[PDB]
Enzyme design. Structure first.
Site, short mmCIF file in Angstrom:
data_model
loop_
_atom_site.label_atom_id
_atom_site.label_comp_id
_atom_site.label_asym_id
_atom_site.label_seq_id
_atom_site.Cartn_x
_atom_site.Cartn_y
_atom_site.Cartn_z
N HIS E 21 0.89 -1.13 0.00
CA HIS E 21 0.00 0.00 0.00
C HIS E 21 0.93 1.19 0.00
CE1 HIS E 21 -2.99 2.85 0.89
NE2 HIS E 21 -3.03 2.75 2.21
N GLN E 87 12.96 -0.20 -0.04
CA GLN E 87 13.64 0.97 -0.55
C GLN E 87 14.03 0.81 -2.06
OE1 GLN E 87 17.50 2.14 1.31
NE2 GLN E 87 17.45 4.09 0.21
#
Ligand code: CA
Ligand code: NA
Ligand code: NA
Lengths: 159, 158, 161, 161, 158
Positions: E21, E87
């Site tokens: 999300h 990341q």
């Protein structure tokens, strides 16, 4: 004298457990010192408070001064030192700076001061907590208002 | 208008464990008081809350007022005090300040008030919590709106 | 109504443990509502979250709505209540406010809504949590956009009408 | 001036447990770097501090620099690491950047630097901690001031590892 | 320029425990996206971090991207997922958006991206964490830059 923009000052004064370290910012209405003052008064958390410094009950120092701790407050004793001796020394230093003209009396109602204090857990002597914070705050104010240490001065001290 | 810039007020009223210390900011639209108000309603943490003060259910005081605590709220009892007697006293103080001409009624819909309440953990008498926070809030507004105390006054009284 | 500045609304709706208390701010681009929206989405902490409200997966409500809890989220049960029924109620209310013209459709893409939701630990009936938060949010939006209650009105009733 | 807007720099330097990761922002008065500097000095929490960087007692580096940790400080040693060698390396880097002209001296009194420091808890060699933060900060400063890496340059390399 | 004001995007992509999300904000210099980016880099707390996203060591994606978590990081395993696969997915998404013409190359050095990620602690497959976060991030940037969903569209689907 004359504060037309944000200025930063810092000082370390005293010895032993009561030694006082002070980070300080002062600035006029319309500047980031004013917004950080308002947000800093509203935003507090466990162990980290902020207060409107007063020199006596119902008598805040002017310019408006937000004092906040940088060392966590974990018990009643540390709080008492913050609100008693340390608050008194910081507040006195701000008002004496106005009395002496370092902060011009005609700008004093339109400036904001932000004071970060570091009180060690080991501090015990109230008279020293008060005195050292008074001195570190007064020093940080004069350094901030006169823009010290100047860039070049500090630069030529590293080489 | 009378309140055209950010003003800060303070007061300490009462005695015992219910003594009320209030830190206050009031300011118009477009000033940092407005931004601090929006950020303050949005940003809460365990033990540190903020709310839009109301006189009664569905009846917020005006000017818009953000009330937030400065003493950690660790248990339900402190929370009931914050939301009950303290909030009622703060909200009444704001509405009474408009009624008494401390805050001009024609500026009420365009100001923001930020009220930091300090309720001691030992506080226990609801009537006093309410009364003292009412009195310290109203006095803080009165002082802030008039820029009191003036620097020369503090310097002199110092 | 037309929203050209920051407006604040609030409402308390419902009964029992699922009673909903909503604090709301709505404002345009360039106003503090927008800055608090951005900082608020970014700055979260243990037990205190904020989310971009959606009416369905991959379908946020517009105007952009940042919803955040006022009561500490200590366990999964409370996180689910926040993200499931309360979020849906809040999002539906914003979208319905737009469908009804309370928030004009031609301004919806340029406003920000900040919604503080207070869900009591005692809350247990999901249909009620969703219903009451929908109603309190809808009511808060109407009060905010219309500037209700006017100070003169509150002043006259401060002691009670 | 040379630094007329907000610039962002970053660098990872060194080896071992003392490897230094620096995130840096620099900008003039009136820019978001100034506002983030004032707020960052004021807002602290358990384990996350911020300080005005000094090269020596009562001797802050210029431009004004706010240093803050990215790894929670849970014990006394993490604190000494943060306040001792780390701070000293950072503060030296800033002054050296001024010395070398990377940050022009005629504007060093009107800029703010924000330095995020990462220190694994396994770090132990104060000597390395200090040199790597010094180098990472210095690199981060020249990258920010020169706007490196350019977006076009990163895009070209996004695939070749 | 195409991105001349703050825009907000979001997306939900994937399945199982690695589902991603993303909440996202993108904006130019002089906008609140820039101020929130600077404040967000500075303000961290127990369990809630922020970082300048990189594609590889010493190679930050551009536009400048601040990635931050929305789910508390309580242990080293969650931290590794955040700094590792998540990341990398977020940073590749931002650089690919530039390569694919979603973000104009000539504006890339003047924009700020803020990316909030939600990594479930149960997430275990690193390749899926990276893939879903990459997919949700690029889709959120594509939606944000174009102002989607438009209010009329959501209203119609409601
Ligand atoms: Ca905060
Ligand atoms: Na009066
Ligand atoms: Na596109």
């Amino acid at each position: 004298a004359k504060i037309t923009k944000v200025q930063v000052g810092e000082a370390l004064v005293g010895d032993g457990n009561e030694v006082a370290h002070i980070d300080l910012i002062i600035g006029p209405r319309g500047s980031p010192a004013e917004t950080a003052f308002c947000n800093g008064l509203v935003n507090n958390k466990h162990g980290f408070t902020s207060l409107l410094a007063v020199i006596a009950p119902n008598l805040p120092c002017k310019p408006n001064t937000l004092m906040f701790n940088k060392v966590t407050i974990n018990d009643a004793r540390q709080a008492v030192q913050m609100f008693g001796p340390a608050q008194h020394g910081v507040a006195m230093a701000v008002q004496d700076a106005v009395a002496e003209g370092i902060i011009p009396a005609d700008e004093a109602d339109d400036l904001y001061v932000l004071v970060g204090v570091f009180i060690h857990w080991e501090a015990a002597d109230d008279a020293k907590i008060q005195k050292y914070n008074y001195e570190a705050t007064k020093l940080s104010i004069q350094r901030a208002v006169n823009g010290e240490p100047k860039a070049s001065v500090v630069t030529e001290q590293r080489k």
